[PDB]
Amino acid sequence: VVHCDMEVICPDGYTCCRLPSGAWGCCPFTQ
Fold this sequence. Notes:
Layout lengths: L1 E4 L2 E3 L3 E5 L5 E5 L3
Antiparallel strand pairs: 1-2, 3-4
């Protein structure tokens, strides 16, 4: 897993994103 930080973790198959409020979100890239 790619620990994007100590508040979220996304596996290589997923991309990490930061919310507009200092938050974190995960989104896959399978389109």
